[PDB]
Amino acid sequence: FQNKANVCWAKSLVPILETAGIKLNDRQWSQIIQAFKEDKAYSPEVALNEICTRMYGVDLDSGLFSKPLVSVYYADNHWDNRPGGKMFGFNPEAASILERKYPFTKGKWNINKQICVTTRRIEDFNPTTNIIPANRRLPHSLVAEHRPVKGERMEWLVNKINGHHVLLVSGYNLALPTKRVTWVAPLGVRGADYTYNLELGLPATLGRYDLVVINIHTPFRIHHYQQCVDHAMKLQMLGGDSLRLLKPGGSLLIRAYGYADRTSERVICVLGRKFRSSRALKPPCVTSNTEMFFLFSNFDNGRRNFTTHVMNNQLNAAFVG
């Protein structure tokens, strides 16, 4: 982990990966997880889903890392292996179940190889292999090819949504004359009301608003599914932290790419329980084939029954390309 200052989360996983016979070099870490390459704060559990997906061709629902062997503990923007945190570790019982569906794997799990489930082979690591987990039933349609879209202005979408007091979380500002905007931006951006390291979330000190607009982009790489994976931690952090920045009856608009991966779908289920209605949009103001907006409307900080069934059908219609 040479010349990396914010990868404590990656260090927290080496003991968990060691239980499964996995040892990743700095190049493999960089290729699998974008946040490692860019040296940014992250979660070990999220990272471990990505590593597990790439190395075994199946996400964490396979249960490969579900044996509680090694703890990961979070304490004031810093991860270590103290006991009392969520525990992970290689689970032979979960491997044994996968050996029936995949006979070739037998006795080749814990040898630091990439279990390519597609072409039934066990090869060295490859950045292009195991992008989508074979075990996971994807909640909605994806697109075969990323394509830019010369679209409409986003102001069109935002001006339709009710709420005078707006919080804009964005790299750039919008023209909203009818709205009272408080613009929050990443560090080094000028012209904003506030600047924060957005890889550490949104501070509660910002106050409560009628409309919260999470407008952070995530570069495309490899596939639609991978763009959801790369965007997942922003949903977790910015979407979750927005819950303490909403007045009663307020709304949360989030630029995103769907919830194709396990992590993104969890976040959306947590958020969906606190709003009267939750909608997945694909309006004319998108910049690409893969983009979409989550509109969570009428916040009550409640806990209602919420399934992704309605947004699944919405996104099935939205994602055709």
Added chain:
Amino acid sequence: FQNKANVCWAKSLVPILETAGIKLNDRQWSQIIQAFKEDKAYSPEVALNEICTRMYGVDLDSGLFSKPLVSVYYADNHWDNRPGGKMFGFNPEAASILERKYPFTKGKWNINKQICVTTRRIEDFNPTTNIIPANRRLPHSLVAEHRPVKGERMEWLVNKINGHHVLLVSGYNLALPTKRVTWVAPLGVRGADYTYNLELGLPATLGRYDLVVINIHTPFRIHHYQQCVDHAMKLQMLGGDSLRLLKPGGSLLIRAYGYADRTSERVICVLGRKFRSSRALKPPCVTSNTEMFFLFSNFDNGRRNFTTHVMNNQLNAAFVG
């Protein structure tokens, strides 16, 4: 862009100008934007307002460059055209609206000509033409003619303002015996506590102060309006970066020339929200007809309702010549 090292911002606009049929040679770039001539860091959006004002006789509020076609992305003191940044591009819908007010323009927007709105003609570029945008309602009075003023010493203004710990951002030092001064200056200046390339802002490492004094001048050229345009980027950079250099209840004094142009007025609205009161002064210690000082008092890093209406009336009384 031959023999220019700091014009990445200008390179970022060629693709945006190309959507509007505009192509500017190195001489036209130099004549429109002073920061290009002098080869200094800048913002594409600010520059684009100046180009749009000169080439079409109307600023960015006309909406001529509001169609999101081409992105401009800022990353570690360097601008390029990565997706995910603020997007610009020629907007025919905005042009069509202006064709009703200006019939002569029809079918002559995208031919690399200067749409002189004054004398209803379409000619080649002229440095003296389209100095003030016809669409913009100016927030306050300007002066018809620049005139020097044999005034008072500035120390007389600074000594009246409360705050013991002072940060002076200036090309030259002041005599403040009652104050504890930390003097910051442009590179190559001797006798200062610190030296920095002020076209890259003010670093947060300087610490927080009771009084911040931004005392950078901007040479006069053409008209009062143009002196605000030329000074605009200093307000954005030095005024904005001063917000992280203020202790609770501190004040920000800024030598300036008003907020006549779109960019300057935006900066002042961002700054005005963080102070208990904001005042526009024209004291005896000015060096010219066009000068003024912004006194932002009692900093709380808040976000209150702020309009320029108070300062507009103050500057209407101040600027009579």
Added chain:
Amino acid sequence: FQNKANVCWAKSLVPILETAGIKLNDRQWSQIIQAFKEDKAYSPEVALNEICTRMYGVDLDSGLFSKPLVSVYYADNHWDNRPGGKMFGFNPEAASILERKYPFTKGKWNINKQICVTTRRIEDFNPTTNIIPANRRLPHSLVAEHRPVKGERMEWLVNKINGHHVLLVSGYNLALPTKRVTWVAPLGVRGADYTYNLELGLPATLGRYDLVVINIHTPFRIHHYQQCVDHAMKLQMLGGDSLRLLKPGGSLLIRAYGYADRTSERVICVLGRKFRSSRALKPPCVTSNTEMFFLFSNFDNGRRNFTTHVMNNQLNAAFVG
């Protein structure tokens, strides 16, 4: 010409307009020429320049009305069509020359239509169309948008100019303690030394003065160019008649809006020949964006070489607002 008592000048043009196939109704006359709407004395030649500018998109220098067909004769504040006066009439040779530059016009000059030469079309009359003549090279800069100016008092300008004995031609009085003022005003004004119908000039009976101050305003309408057109007849009348009200070495100060149009520029050339020096000012005591003062200094009633080149450069610096 129903319910109009002072429009003999308009009646004098019907026969001239008839040679060009033009027939203007009372509404069209009112919209083109302000003096018609208000029912005031005027010149057919001046009016004909305005009509020609509006109907053909080019002023009288095009030569469209230069064929001597119909005379206009002036005799004791009354215009008619006696022979021996200046002659006008449609000139096909002048039209022929314009058909090369403008092919669409061919065979459509004498059909009572407005030849919009900006947008290459032939439509019915429109008050907003053909405000500025395409053929005329404007002698100086204009302003794209009229804007009021909270300025200084005019007394500050008048008190700087030498001459004890002052003639003020104005709707309102000035406070000039150092000057011996004779205040002339339009009819119905009280507090003045004399009252006269200023649309008939200034009578020589008033005597000769050291400083003559023509301080009549002209309401803004449409554009800067149009404000010069509307003010043109006051320059002609009051500025010209002031020449017999000046002692040797006296000066003539005239509130005006430039000399953008053909008629105003002629008057200024006639006046400029009689004074040692002639200056175009834009001092702090203006009431608008478009105002200026002509200062003709040191009267000798001579005839020297005079070009507008000096004042052109002065007004280029004055008007950029």
Added chain:
Amino acid sequence: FQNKANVCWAKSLVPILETAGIKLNDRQWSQIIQAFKEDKAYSPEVALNEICTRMYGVDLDSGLFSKPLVSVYYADNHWDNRPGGKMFGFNPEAASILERKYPFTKGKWNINKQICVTTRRIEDFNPTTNIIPANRRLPHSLVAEHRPVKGERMEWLVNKINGHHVLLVSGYNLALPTKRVTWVAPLGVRGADYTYNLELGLPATLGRYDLVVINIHTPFRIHHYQQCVDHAMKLQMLGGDSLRLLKPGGSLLIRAYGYADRTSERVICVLGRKFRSSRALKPPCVTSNTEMFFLFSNFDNGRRNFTTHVMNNQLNAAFVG
């Protein structure tokens, strides 16, 4: 002579007319001499030629008024009957000679009747009778009926004639870009360099010029001959006074109608002696059947032999119609 201010010249003739038994009422004076009707300055000798032509059917060369009985003296724009001026009075010796050619006249000269010598009768005055004097051999052809002509612009004639410094004496201005024009006009005309009562001549104060252009019209009435008679005093005054307004080698262009009458032919003989060559033109830029221009070229203020023989033949070719 009731309500006439400028008819001292007419009062000067009553004693001369009394010697011939003629007494003219205000209506007869008005009908014979246009300058009386219009109340303008004039010469008694010129007037007396017109009266003698109308009352006796023969001009002053008959010698009817050649007996020196009564003097007419001119002193500072005022005529009276002091001795020492030119003397006139009825001459019986001249009448006696005409009685042989006209027997019916015997003893009926001095009875205040109109001696119609065409139709051999002696009747009361008639405005239509004795328009052309029977004794006078006309120097050139006239036209039987006045007819307007839709001609060319005069500028085309003036631009052909050499001389940069031009003096225009006219009711209206000309467009002469290649010339340096000083425009003199009758009183009440605006736009001119100078205004003067042209019935009192042209003042020497105007200075000397390369080209002098006398462009005053004379309304047609009755016949061609009468239009020369009516124009005669303008030739005398303006043509004569132009001699002190010519630089060495300069030219004098005069709009006129020929020199059919005795007075006009005298003026032309006086003028013709001072120029190298003298020409009578009938160019395309005339406004009527009866018009012509005198071009006196290359002024030396000399006194050479000059006869009308050359211009007679020129005008014979010009006037056919």
